[PDB]
Amino acid sequence: YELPEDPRWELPRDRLVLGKPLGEGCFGQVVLAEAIGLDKDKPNRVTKVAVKMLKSDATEKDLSDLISEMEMMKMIGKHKNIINLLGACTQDGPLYVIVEYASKGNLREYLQARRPPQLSSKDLVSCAYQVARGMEYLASKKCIHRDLAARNVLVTEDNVMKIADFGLYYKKTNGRLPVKWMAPEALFDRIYTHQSDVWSFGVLLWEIFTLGGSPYPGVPVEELFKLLKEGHRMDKPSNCTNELYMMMRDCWHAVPSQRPTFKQLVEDLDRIVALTSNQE
Numbered sequence: 001y002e003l004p005e006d007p008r009w010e011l012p013r014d015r016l017v018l019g020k021p022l023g024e025g026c027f028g029q030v031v032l033a034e035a036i037g038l039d040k041d042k043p044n045r046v047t048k049v050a051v052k053m054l055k056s057d058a059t060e061k062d063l064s065d066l067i068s069e070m071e072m073m074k075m076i077g078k079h080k081n082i083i084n085l086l087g088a089c090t091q092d093g094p095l096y097v098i099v100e101y102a103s104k105g106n107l108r109e110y111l112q113a114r115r116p117p118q119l120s121s122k123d124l125v126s127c128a129y130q131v132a133r134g135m136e137y138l139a140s141k142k143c144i145h146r147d148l149a150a151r152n153v154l155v156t157e158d159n160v161m162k163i164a165d166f167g168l169y170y171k172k173t174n175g176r177l178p179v180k181w182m183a184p185e186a187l188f189d190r191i192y193t194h195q196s197d198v199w200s201f202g203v204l205l206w207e208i209f210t211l212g213g214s215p216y217p218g219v220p221v222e223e224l225f226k227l228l229k230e231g232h233r234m235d236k237p238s239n240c241t242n243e244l245y246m247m248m249r250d251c252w253h254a255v256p257s258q259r260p261t262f263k264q265l266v267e268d269l270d271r272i273v274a275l276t277s278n279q280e
């Protein structure tokens with residue numbers, strides 16, 4: 001196979017120093033690495049980056065999957081609250097797609113690790129605000145995520161929330177059961193919209209305020225379907241205000257057209273971040 005070069009995105013292969021693999025626990029073959037001179041002005045600067053590449057046993061679908069993902073990230077463009085495309089190696093060897101490094105891992109591990117054996121209320125609302133700003137931006141570029149959860153948000157060395165894997169039965173993965181994040185129309189009718197991501201955002205808010213708890217406590221997966229059809233929703237977590245719980249319930253409206261938009265959620269969360277104190 002032969003790829004076209006975009007000199008804007010192309011990094012010479014000897015500027016990339018590959019490091020430790022991540023393996024199962026991230027989608028596809030991902031390698032931590034160091035890119036040398038990623039800004040032309042600062043060619044002696046080294047930047048930490050993540051690299052996606054193909055396995056040894058990769059099919060023709062796998063190659064095209066990695067090319068479509070890379071191209072979709074160009075279409076979408078840059079936001080501080082998404083994992084940004086930084087560059088690619090397309091020419092004198094296999095396909096590398098190079099993205100931003102998030103030193104503190106996924107949001108679920110970050111929240112779990114900072115449980116009392118720490119985060120203020122403002123940190124947690126500021127986290128939800130940043131995840132909302134990322135999703136508002138992705139929505140504006142017509143990008144439906146289809147698997148929004150804390151595990152698919154990453155955290156940088158400066159505690160910036162970056163949405164991950166946006167350019168892509170009830171059995172476990174990591175050990176996660178995705179169905180718990182799916183809107184009813186997605187679960188029952190295989191329908192995915194921007195409104196289905198707002199449902200999943202509701203479950204992500206619940207994740208943030210329980211410091212990375214399992215959604216629907218004490219509910220077996222077998223009887224979760226019946227409970228949703230009955231109109232059951234998760235109850236309010238204790239580290240959470242009535243305003244923020246009213247926001248969750250609004251995200252979990254049974255009719256997708258009656259849920260708030262990410263634009264609407266960013267406006268409300270902008271206000272709540274200012275009203276929330278750094279001692280509360």
Ligand SMILES: *CCC(=O)Nc1cccc(C)c1Nc1ncc(OCc2c(Cl)c(OC)cc(OC)c2Cl)cn1
Nearest residue numbers: 025026050051052083099101102103105106164165166
């Ligand atoms: C899998 C999530 C996680 O916990 N990652 C992790 C684990 C231990 C240490 C570190 C530093 C990280 N951070 C990290 N993992 C992956 C990553 O980028 C993955 C990626 C890629 Cl390669 C991609 O290429 C097309 C597109 C993405 O989303 C748009 C993502 Cl998230 C960055 N940092």
